[PDB]
RNA sequence: ACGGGGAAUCAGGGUUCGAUUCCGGAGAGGGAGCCUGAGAAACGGCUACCACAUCCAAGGAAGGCAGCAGGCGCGCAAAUU
RNA sequence: UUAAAGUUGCUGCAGUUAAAAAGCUCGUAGUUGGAUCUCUCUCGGCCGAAGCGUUUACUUUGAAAAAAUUAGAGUGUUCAAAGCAGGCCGCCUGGAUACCGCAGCUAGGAAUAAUGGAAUAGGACCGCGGUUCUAUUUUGUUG
RNA sequence: GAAGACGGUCGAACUUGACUAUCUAGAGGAAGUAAAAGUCGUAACAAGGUUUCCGUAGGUGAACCUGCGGAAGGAUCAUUA
């Protein structure tokens, strides 16, 4: 059971903060320790250079070809596999270019078929993925 | 349910509603006062003295008699012991166990069994410590005890 | 920071000026005189914002350098000269005469005044001391030191100061039974007459009031003026006779007198 | 002798005592006469602040301190120093979340007089605010009530 | 041990509304439990009781009607300042029509519609419906 | 982690944010020392040292945008000399 | 980041088998603890001072708590978000009010909960005597 | 009454040690990670072909095996005067 008395406020806030940390996301929060070990540091977007265009298979009950991108991350060196999204969307992009990468959805975890793959391309060149898929503007070199 | 014990018995006394001294009892509150003087210059407890009185000589309660109960008439005459009556039981026993410890080392038995009557002597030296029945300074050492009772 | 500030902010300033929100960032700080910055009116809000006399910051200059104001008596050229409590304000061009005394709800008001009246204020007794070869002096609540005082006058009195010369008149003394405004709190610009006062020594003596409908309250002793002896006001009083009407029927008479229209 | 113990002479500084007298005064008794003051709040002035000997700056009663402030209380704790011992407060402090309080405590150095001497530990005494005394001293000791497992 | 006479004789007697039965005994009895227990007979949710004089501490022998949907008791006792009364008799009470919430007021044990008249804070008790 | 007044969410209880226009603190590249003055250990004052850095005829001279604009750098990320 | 999350649980979770009760016992701190007990003395004009009683926690009232924000009153910004304005044919207005935890002041209550009060009576209330210090009036002023 | 000196104090800073901490070039090997549908038995789930599981010691190609002491989460809630 649980104590009741009128004097044990002590006991009862000091129990739930030696509790809290139990939790596996109040940890990952307050801990710091995924946070220097996050590529972006706490940001939702960051920039990089892209190294190699890799492509990465599918998980096991279903077949394809992801295509993803290597990159190099500008603020702290640190590389990244992300993931190029649409049909067609390589093509848009060459190496050495600079990439505005984001979160794929699911905070820092990968999202379903594709193994170890956290993030996803949203601008190539200073332009947005979804303005050359849809053809509104032309790649800039 | 018992201190030191997991025995949770049921086995007491149980004093009657009519709190009066009966019809038949010819002693009088002094008379009794005189028998308990005796009784203790005897070398009785006062657990002892009202037990005698009740078996041989048919007092009941001796503070449904007199007004006052055993101890408070032997502590006003003066032929009352320095450490209470259950304390002296408990200190008595811890020698005996001490005592004979060292002629059986290997006994884990009664080493276990010195300690339960160890914990209840601090127990009952707190409580008179701080009723103030004892000095503020007495506590039980282990080598000097053959000399307390 | 490093010595004194000079401007005060606008939302920073006292509830009771009543300066609206939007008209800028600084409001405007009063001069040191004789009241405190938080009890005081400056002369810029009197004559600009209560008064419609001018209409911007410019023309509370351009009235007070022509000479035309008169702050107890004496010409005051300073548009933020803090005039406080019991102040008489004669402007002779038009041939008003104000005295500013708080209202109901905790605020100053216009309280235009007879020129007769004009001739005297009371003050309030703060500190008596003797020295400089045995020669008694007050200190009242305007900072005025009127020395020779008369022997019966104490602390937490009232005096009456002839406002042409600067001597006292008579005086009202504390006692029970006399009509006090108060003058800070939140039972400010309420009047009564003293019931009771109890004394906390080494804290603050309360001095329990009561209305003339019957309202009672309390307040500490600094925020306890004796406007009269017995229930007869030595001054003037306002509109409201210092009773605070409860909103209930503070909206009652709003709308039973709208009904006398036509 | 039995106050100068130290290397500057201890005097009441407020007392004059070394006025010139006549054949009645010096065969008659030799009478140093003691300052006292009253602190206001009724607090009694003991005895031994008026028939004492002892010499002592910071003493509410002989000295010279005003007692302005808030009057307190404590339980005495240690008295190991020269003429100041150690009390602690005890106070309950609300939890908001849990509706429960806590038992939380506080301790003040604080000043005893030499009036005030037979004090044991374990008994309240109230205190009273003053300005520095040291550097961890402001209040001085007012009176003395002792445990109720005395007599 | 016995920590809290009170709560060990409300549910005495909420273990028997259950059963059926129509009298408990509530052995010890303390004056706060015949406080409480007038207070749930005075509106009618439990009928006379009678109070055993032993030399020791008293039982109580209580006949029941069969009214009382639930007694309980509060632990701790906690202060309840009057404009803080709703919440609680809201987190107890099934409905704002019936059930009772019994505090000690320093003007004495009541329910909290006498509390709320004359205008008294207290300690919570307990409840009843 | 500058602190409060406060902000978001919320049945009741709560949880989290509060650099940011009001109050209070601190600081003017980093430490340190002063002059003047009612008030400063002041930087749109001075004197040093450490760090940068402007002119120079090479002997010297002058610096301090976490003021308003504006520039570079940084970055996912922020306006008119 | 907040709710959803009664998946951090004070309200309000769980612990045989789903994650989980320490091998057993003693033990200091902490936490929690059984019945019981129905305002007066020296003064001023019967009404105020002064004292309390053992000390508190609790509860209710009071006074003190920056403005802005929040809640909320009044007001046809053309509606509204706002604003503190406005209205009538020189006058008449408004610029309210609530909330402002804990700690600290104040006054009433006395249930609950802690705590004292005499047990080798150096105990209460009475009038009786002694020892030591000593007030300042008394002897038309004066030592 | 200026320069300048003795001494005091405040104290930036410098030099060399110790303790560290961080930015930086380098063969060697190390561990886990991305898969693997690659080869030998078949430890386990049926009495899983030596019931299984627990602690603890020893030996191996390895799932493991064996000595001691438990438990049933067993394959018996039971075995006759």
């Known amino acids: ?141 | 349910g018992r201190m030191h014990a997991p025995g949770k018995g049921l086995s007491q006394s149980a004093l009657p509603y009519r709190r009066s001294v009966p019809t038949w009892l010819k002693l009088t509150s002094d008379d009794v006062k005189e028998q308990i003087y005796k009784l203790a210059k005897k070398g009785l407890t006062p657990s002892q003295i009202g037990v005698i009185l009740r078996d041989s000589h048919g007092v009941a309660q001796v503070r449904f008699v007199t007004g006052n109960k055993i101890l408070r008439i032997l502590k006003s005459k003066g032929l009352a012991p320095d450490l209470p009556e259950d304390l002296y039981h408990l200190i008595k026993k811890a020698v005996a166990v001490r005592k004979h410890l060292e002629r059986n080392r290997k006994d884990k038995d009664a080493k276990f069994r010195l300690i339960l009557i160890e914990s209840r002597i601090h127990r009952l030296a707190r409580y008179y410590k701080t009723k103030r029945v004892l000095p503020p300074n007495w506590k039980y050492e282990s080598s000097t005890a053959s000399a307390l009772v | 920071a490093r010595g004194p500030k000079k401007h005060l902010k606008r939302v920073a300033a006292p509830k009771h000026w009543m300066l609206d929100k939007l008209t800028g960032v600084f409001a405007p700080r009063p001069s040191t005189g004789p009241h405190k910055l938080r009890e005081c009116l400056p002369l810029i809000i009197f004559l600009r914002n209560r008064l419609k006399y001018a209409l911007t910051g410019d023309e509370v200059k351009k009235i007070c350098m022509q000479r035309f104001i008169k702050i107890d008596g004496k010409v005051r050229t300073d548009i933020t000269y803090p005039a406080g409590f019991m102040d008489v304000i004669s402007i002779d061009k038009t041939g008003e005469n104000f005295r500013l005394i708080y209202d109901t709800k905790g605020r100053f008001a216009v309280h235009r005044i007879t020129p007769e009246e004009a001739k005297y204020k009371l003050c309030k007794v703060r500190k008596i001391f003797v020295g400089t070869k045995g020669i008694p002096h007050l200190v009242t609540h305007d900072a005025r030191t009127i020395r020779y005082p008369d022997p019966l006058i104490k602390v937490n009195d009232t005096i009456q100061i002839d406002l042409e010369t600067g001597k006292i008149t008579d005086f009202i003394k504390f006692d029970t039974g006399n009509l006090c405004m108060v003058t800070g709190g939140a039972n400010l610009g309420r009047i009564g007459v003293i019931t009771n006062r109890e004394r906390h020594p080494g804290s603050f003596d309360v001095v329990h009031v009561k209305d003339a409908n019957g309202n009672s309250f309390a307040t500490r002793l600094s925020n306890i003026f004796v406007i009269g002896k017995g229930n007869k006001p030595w001054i003037s009083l306002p509109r409201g006779k210092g009773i605070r009407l409860t909103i209930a029927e503070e909206r009652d008479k709003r709308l039973a007198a709208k009904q006398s229209s036509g | 002798a039995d106050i100068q113990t130290e290397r500057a002479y201890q005097k009441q500084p407020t007392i004059f005592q070394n006025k010139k007298r006549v054949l009645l005064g010096e065969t008659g008794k030799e009478k140093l006469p003691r300052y006292y003051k009253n602190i206001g709040l009724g607090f009694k002035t003991p005895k031994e602040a008026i028939e004492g000997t002892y010499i002592d700056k910071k003493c509410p009663f002989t000295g010279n301190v005003s007692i302005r402030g808030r009057i307190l209380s404590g339980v005495v704790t240690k008295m190991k120093m020269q003429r100041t011992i150690v009390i602690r407060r005890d106070y309950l402090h609300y939890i908001r979340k849990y509706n429960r309080f806590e038992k939380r405590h506080k301790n003040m150095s604080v000043h005893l007089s030499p009036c005030f001497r037979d004090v044991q530990i374990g008994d309240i005494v109230t205190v009273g605010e003053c300005r520095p005394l040291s550097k961890t001293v402001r209040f001085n000791v007012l009176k003395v009530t002792k445990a109720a497992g005395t007599k | 041990v016995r920590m809290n006479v009170l709560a060990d004789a409300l549910k005495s007697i909420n273990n028997a509304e259950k059963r059926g039965k129509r009298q408990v005994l509530i052995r010890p009895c303390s004056k706060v439990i015949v406080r409480f227990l007038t207070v749930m007979m005075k509106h009618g949710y439990i009928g006379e009781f009678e109070i055993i004089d032993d030399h020791r501490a008293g039982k109580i022998v209580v006949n029941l009607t069969g009214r009382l949907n639930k007694c309980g008791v509060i632990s701790p006792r906690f202060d309840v300042q009057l404009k803080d009364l709703e919440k609680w008799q809201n987190n107890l009470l099934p409905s704002r029509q019936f059930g009772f919430i019994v505090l000690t007021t320093s003007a004495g044990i009541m329910d909290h519609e006498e509390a709320r008249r004359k205008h008294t804070g207290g300690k919570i008790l307990g409840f009843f419906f």
């Open chain 1, 1 to 141: 059971g649980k104590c009741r008395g009128l004097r044990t406020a002590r006991k009862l806030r000091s129990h739930r903060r030696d509790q809290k940390w139990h939790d596996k996301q109040y940890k990952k929060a307050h801990l710091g320790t995924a946070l220097k070990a996050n590529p972006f540091g706490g940001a939702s977007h960051a920039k990089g250079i892209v190294l190699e265009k890799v492509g990465v298979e599918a998980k096991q009950p279903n077949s394809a070809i992801r295509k993803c991108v290597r990159v190099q991350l500008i603020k702290n060196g640190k590389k990244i596999t992300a993931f190029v999204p649409n049909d067609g969307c390589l093509n848009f992009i060459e190496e050495n270019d600079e990439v505005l990468v984001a979160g794929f959805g699911r905070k820092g975890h990968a999202v379903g078929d594709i193994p170890g793959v956290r993030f996803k391309v949203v601008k190539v060149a200073n332009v947005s993925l979804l303005a050359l898929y849809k053809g509104k503007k032309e790649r800039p070199r």
